């Protein structure tokens, strides 16, 4: 019983934590794409200049 409760404190649910991981890594790639889009506007400011 004690080791079971220990586990319920400590035991990772690798399923949950890998869904969460997959998610978060994808959020990294996501936000990186958002920068890749964000930085594309000032060039059109140059087009305003010329």
């Amino acid at each position: 019983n004690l080791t079971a409760a220990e586990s319920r404190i400590r035991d990772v649910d690798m399923a949950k934590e890998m869904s969460e991981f997959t998610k978060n890594n994808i959020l990294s790639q996501a936000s990186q794409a958002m920068l890749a889009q964000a930085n594309q506007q000032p060039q059109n400011v140059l087009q305003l200049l010329r």
């Binding site: 404190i9 400590r10 990772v12 934590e17 969460e20 991981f21 978060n24 959020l27 936000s31 930085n39």
Partner: protein
């Protein structure tokens, strides 16, 4: 409109998600949600007893 990217929250979201992912792997590799004490001090002290 250019000298400072407005997309600055996006950077801290990037740092957040990267750090998150790091901690995720820390748990996944260790097999412990309580691997470091910063996780849950309460469940830590419990698990100690």
């Amino acid at each position: 409109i250019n000298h400072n990217i407005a997309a600055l929250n996006t950077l801290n979201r990037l740092s957040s998600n990267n750090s998150a992912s790091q901690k995720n792997m820390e748990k996944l590799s260790s097999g412990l949600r309580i691997n470091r004490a910063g996780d849950d001090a309460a469940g830590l002290a419990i698990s100690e007893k």
